[PDB]
Every structure is written in C-alpha cells, then in structure tokens.
Design a protein around this ligand. Structure first.
Ligand SMILES: Nc1ncnc2c1ncn2[C@@H]1O[C@H](CSCC[C@H](N)C(=O)O)[C@@H](O)[C@H]1O
Ligand SMILES: Nc1ncnc2c1ncn2[C@@H]1O[C@H](CSCC[C@H](N)C(=O)O)[C@@H](O)[C@H]1O
Lengths: 273, 160, 275, 159
C-alpha cells in the first residue's frame, strides 16, 4: 500500500541444474539483481556458466551453505529448488525414502528457506517454489506437504509442451493453480520438435523409439529434446559432454513453459525490462 | 527477566515421559509437558504427523525441546521440525534449550548431517546434541545421563 | 562472348563430408541448381541432410557412381572433392601410398572428373577442385599433379582463421593463387573462438601434452563449438544425430576450412546466378 | 576407313618387346610402337612418369594400348588409356589389353573390373582384361596374348 520504484528480483536457486529458473526469469523480462545457485554436477554448472555469461554466482553443495551465508548473501526475494528424486521415485525399488539417501536433501531446502524467510513483521514480498515428482510414496508426499505447510499443485507439461511430465509444485507463488495458457510459442506436438526429415510416432513423448527417419526408427535427438522441454536449441551444447550426459541433464530439468507459467505473476512485483 | 517460572517442555522422545521423570528427578517445576512420537496440562498428542505449527503455537510457549532414542533420519527430522516451530522468534532472548539423543552406532553421514543441522558437535557418553551449558563441544576427530546433562536447567527455571 | 542470363550452378561433390562446399556456395550468394554428393560416413550424411534441408541428393559410395550416372545426372558445372588421406599422410607409418589402401580413392575423382568434363568443342565453363594434405609423400604429390595435369596451390587456413591447416588444392578455379583476404568476419585468433569464461593458451591451434585453453585455473581441450568457430563453420553446425563428441571432432577434423573454400569459390560469382 | 592400315601401339607392358613380338607373330604391320615402363619408328620412352598427355597426342594417334605384367601400374595404364582414347564421335578402331596375375586381392580385381568396365578372362593362371572381340566376359605369355590378339588381323593391315 506504499510507493516505491520496482526493484530487480534476488534469487536463490538450490539444485539449479541447467539454470532453468534464470532462463525463465530472463524470458519473462524480469530484471535479475542477483542469482546465487547451489549445484554440484559440473556439467550443469558449465551449462549455466556458459549460457548466462557468469551472471550466476555458484556456491556448490547445498550442504555447505550456512544460515550466516544466507544472511550475508541475502536478502532474497525468490527461493526455488528441485531436489534429486532417485530416492523418492516408486519406480526405483532400491529407493531409500524421503529421510535417507538423496531424498533427505529436501530438508536442506526446508532449512535454507527458513533461513531466508523475512523476519516476523517484515511485510516485504517473498516467494518460494519446490518441485518434485508425482510418482513418489504417498507417505513421502504427505511428509513434504507437512514440512512445507502447503499442499502441492500438480502440473503436467503435456499441456504446454510435447512431453508427458507431471510434477508436484509446492510454493506460495501467486496463482499457481490457475489454468495454464497454451500460447503460440508452445510446441504442443512432438512432430513440431523434430529436425528436418523425421516423423513422430506419438503426439507426446513419455520419456520406445519415438521417431521414424527414412524407414528406420530412431530415438529422440538432443536438440529435439531441448525443443520438447522448451529449452532453446543447442542450450546444452557445451563442454564436450557425451550425448548420454546431455540427455541426463535434460531429463532432470524443469519444463520451461511450466516454470514460465509459475513465474509469470512475479512481473507485478519486481522491475521488468 | 522475571522471577523463575516453571518449565514448559515439548517431547518427541522415543520413551514418553522420560524427560518428565528426569525433570522431577532434578526437582524442576513443570507447567506444561506435551509428548509425541514418530510411529510409522500434561498431554500425549500421539503421532507427530498430526502436530502442526499452529498446534505448537497454541500449546506453547515452550522452554525445552527434547527428542531422540536410546533409519535415524526420520526421528531427527521430525525433531528438527518441532525445534524450528518451537524456537523463539528473533529478538526474543527468553531461555530456550533442546536435547537430542541417539545411538553412536550411526552412519558418519548421519552424524555429520545432524551436527550440521543442529550447529553443534555431539557429546559422546550414545551421542547427545544440545545447547545446555556444558554440552558445548569442539570439532570431533537409563536416565542418569540426561539428569547430569539437564543439571544446568535448575539455574534457569523454578524449582520446587 | 555471347549473351545469356546467368544460370544456377550444378555441383558434384565427392567425399563431401559435412557439405562444406554447399555451405560456402550458399554463403557467397551463388544459386545452386542441384547438389549431388558422394559420401559414405552416415554421420556426415546426417549433418548435410539436416543443415541443408534435404537439398543434397546423396548417392553413396563414390565407387558406385558410373559414367552413365554422370551423363544422366549431368551436366555439372563444378566438380569438387577431398579424398581420404590416412594412407597419404607421412605421419602414418602404416600408410599404403597413393595407389593402395584408401589413397587409390583419389583415382575415383580422376575417373569421374574425366566423365564430367564437357566433350571437346563445348566452350561452356567447367571447374573442378581437389583438396588433400601437404604432409604427404613427395612421390605421391608428384603423381597427383601428374594425373591432374596441374600443379597444386598451397593454402594454410592460419592466414584466414585461427587454425594451422596447410593443404594442397589442385584445380582450374579462377585465381586460386591470388592473395587471400582477411575480412572482418574472420576470427584470426583462438581467443575469438572460445566460449565465455575461457582463455586461449596460443594464438592458433594445431592438429601432445598441450591443452589449448585455460578455464578457471584448469587446463582443457577445445570444445566442439569452439572447433566449429576455429574452422569457420556456424556454431552448432555439427550438433545433430546424437553422435559422440569424439565423432563430432572426427567430422570437424576431416573438413575444409570454411574461409579457405570461400576464398577459392569467390570468383564463381561472375560465372553463375547469384541471389 | 580407306583401307586396312598398319597398327599403332602404346605399350606400358612389363617387357618392352612382348607386344611387338606378338604382333609380328601374327603378321600385323606396325607403323608405330612406343614402349614405357613403371620404374620407380619404334621407340623406348623410359619412365611412364615422364610421359604426358601432350606426348601421347604428338606420338599418336594410337590403335592398341597394352599393359600389365605376368598393383600401382594399373593406374598408370589407365591414365595412358584415357590419354590415348579416341575423342567422342571418332568411331575408329581402338583396342586395349591389361594382363595381371590371378594372385591378386579380390578388392584389386573388383576395382580393375570397375575401372575398365570389363570382367576378366581367366587363363590357367592369369587375368586378362580387354575389349578385343572374344574378350567379352560376364560376371611365357606370348602364345596366349597371340591367341587373344588374333582378332586384330581383321582390323589392321597384315604383311
Ligand atoms: N548435494 C547437492 N547440492 C547441490 N545440488 C545437488 C546436490 N546433489 C544433487 N544436486 C543437483 O540437484 C539437481 C536436481 S535435478 C533438478 C535440476 C533443476 N531443477 C533443473 O531444472 O535443471 C541435479 O542437477 C543435481 O546436480
Ligand atoms: N568410398 C567412399 N565413397 C564416398 N566417400 C567416401 C568414401 N570413403 C571415404 N569417404 C568420405 O570422404 C571424406 C574425406 S574427408 C573430406 C571431407 C570434406 N572435404 C569436408 O569438407 O568435410 C570422409 O568424410 C569420408 O566419409
């Protein structure tokens, strides 16, 4: 209810991956004051380091960030994160649950978020987002929704892309449950993502052989995967990594249109280009 | 800083009323004792999954938070949630103490993670974390135990 | 000496690789009627198929192309080729020479070229280019110059790019020996080709115990996009078909330096239609 | 043609005199016989690597081209063949023979058959490629080359 000039957003991204959050914030025209990312895989760090010109301040393992570090590096306006899910997926029979293995990394989030929340009486806007899979144990989902004191929003990227990708999003972002918008940039069909001379067997990919090329079924190429998930073409064409490693990076990533849908209302809260 | 008042305790301990027995053993007045467990004005509230931040706010304020057992992650993380929910707000210098017990037979990953989250290195006896004057420890390289550890509490709260 | 509207060029590319010739012809603004390429490695075929939208008519092994094929597919205005060199380089001790192994592939060129030149009395313009390595046996170079009835022109990509790449070019292209022009598009230094956050040890790269680039106080080899920039190709030009970065490096190593081929093909604008 | 005229021959054969011996053994008149080897008026011209296309033009026209040995020399023979072939539209008679040993790589046999557009004649054991009538095939050496050259008596003058 008071007057001030809109200021650029200050972001803390845990488990940043290939810097989907910064890409989405840039695409929305939101000015990014600061982008401190916690990422441990060197390939993802190289992707984000190259494709954003060292704007990202990398701090490494999320377990090496202390509350004093949050206070000194802060304040932060947005705290986003997507913890590893190999120990949360019911597909994995050797899963260790939410509290063991790599699932307990979630609590790191729950830690730093509470360290980054404005102190009581501070009416400044503050937003956070935590993404994970839907195919987790019901007990794990209940526990996550208990710790975060929020019920998740189920969003499937098949509605704004050519990928079957349903995910749970906890957070306090404005209107996360609002209906998604299929715009003209959205490539809703797998055929729209293929390179020249390839045909798509299915409308939306579920990652058999999804494409036919000159009477010979193939798998999806890497640039086609970038198009499917909404990333710019050759966005992951850095650092001489194997195609399997690039596929690994792209599979753990966020669907760009989904994150754009989630971040769009932030334009009425921060400076915009 | 008013005159000494009776202590208010929140227990997620594996053995219910262990903390209450230790407190009565030291002769400390108890104004409230809320106990809970993990499963899979002195009250037992059952499953910790049923305890919310609003419940902690209503039953509170709390002065002591105890937890542990004589996977280790679930117990500690429930205890950590309750500790965060019961901790005084920044700028409230009122006394607030906590203790977490576990067995020494735990993965080094678990011990280091617990020490990191609690910002405290453990006391070896079993392993014990706490902020009571006495269990401040540098970097590492039966209820009588809790009695001796809780000894400094009678210097901060009213005794009968 | 007579009048006619200049027509688009008809090209036969043997050992085409990643379609460097078509890329250079397009960049110069020359109109391409048709582009028939003989290539056997499927990675190169996928590169050329994707990055030029299926405009290349692929015919496969050069040894499967007959004189009747050259006649029926023709006429052709430009016959270009760069045969494999692993049996011609002196760096290979197991080299089999020009006449055995993969070196004899050269003669396929010499074959099809003679099947493609206009019959005597046909005053129509007709050009051809054959590229190979400098580090080859002197006897092999003399034999190639004998069979092609032309002395080669030595061109090093270092003069017009950031790569050490000296090659022999036999051909009747107009003014092949003319001085090369260093334009503004040319990235003469390796630093100009590196991605963000990397520093170049040297000024120009060579074809061990040297990691050409420093990155954040660590030694690294050249990235694929940086190799593309070094060789003159567009960025992500070889980012197709899920091939290993080693295979991408192999494709880029065998290729022509784009600015060198542009220098060689420039005078063709005065002979064919230009968009 | 005006009449039967004496033959003109270009020999890259290993053994400079073989072609002339076989030609005189069949009684065929010879206006020109020029022999060359691989190294590395009847006349010897030395290394084939010294023979140019202009030399073939000046010494020519040629009616017969022979090469081989009872290999890198096949490509030299093929160069001389291309240089000696009649221009398009010249239906004058022109013949060639290439001999090699049957002990060759199957790759070499296939490559020679491709380049010469002809399948070879097996003679147990040597391979003979040629366009003489009777050398059409589907998929010392003096007497056999004599019997193979036999059809030359019907295209050139005999003494
Ligand atoms: N201990 C740790 N500290 C910080 N990051 C970690 C970590 N362990 C795993 N990670 C990272 O967390 C990521 C989870 S996958 C999520 C990636 C990101 N949401 C994106 O859109 O790209 C992985 O990329 C992994 O590299
Ligand atoms: N038998 C054959 N028929 C047709 N192409 C062949 C061949 N054997 C090898 N090649 C191709 O010849 C190429 C020689 S390397 C030259 C590539 C090309 N000049 C460029 O600029 O990219 C190789 O890519 C190889 O795939």
């Amino acid at each position: 209810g008071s007057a001030e000039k809109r200021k650029p957003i200050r972001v803390l991204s845990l488990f940043d991956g290939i810097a989907t959050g910064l890409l989405v914030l840039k695409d929305l025209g939101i000015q990014v004051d600061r982008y401190i990312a916690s990422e441990v895989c060197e390939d993802s760090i190289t992707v984000g380091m190259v494709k954003h010109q060292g704007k990202i301040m990398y701090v490494g393992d999320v377990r090496s960030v202390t509350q004093k570090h949050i206070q000194e590096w802060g304040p932060f306006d947005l705290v986003i994160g997507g913890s590893p899910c190999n120990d949360l997926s019911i597909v994995n029979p050797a899963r260790k649950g939410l509290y063991e293995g790599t699932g307990r990394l979630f609590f790191e989030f729950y830690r730093l978020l509470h360290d980054a929340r404005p102190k009581e009486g501070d009416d400044r806007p503050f937003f956070w987002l935590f993404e994970n899979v839907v195919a987790m144990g019901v007990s794990d989902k209940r526990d996550i929704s208990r710790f975060l004191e929020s019920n998740p929003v189920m969003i499937d990227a098949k509605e704004v892309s050519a990928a079957h990708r349903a995910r749970y999003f906890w957070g306090n972002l404005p209107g996360m449950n609002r209906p998604l918008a299929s715009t003209v940039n959205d490539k809703l069909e797998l055929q729209e993502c293929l390179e020249h001379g390839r045909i798509a067997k299915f409308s939306k990919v579920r990652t058999h052989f999804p494409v036919f090329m000159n009477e010979k079924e193939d798998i999806l190429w890497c640039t086609e995967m970038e198009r499917v998930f909404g990333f710019p073409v050759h966005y992951t064409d850095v650092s001489n990594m194997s195609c399997l490693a690039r596929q690994r990076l792209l599979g753990r990533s966020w669907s760009v249109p989904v994150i754009r849908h989630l971040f769009a209302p932030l334009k009425e809260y921060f400076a915009c280009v």
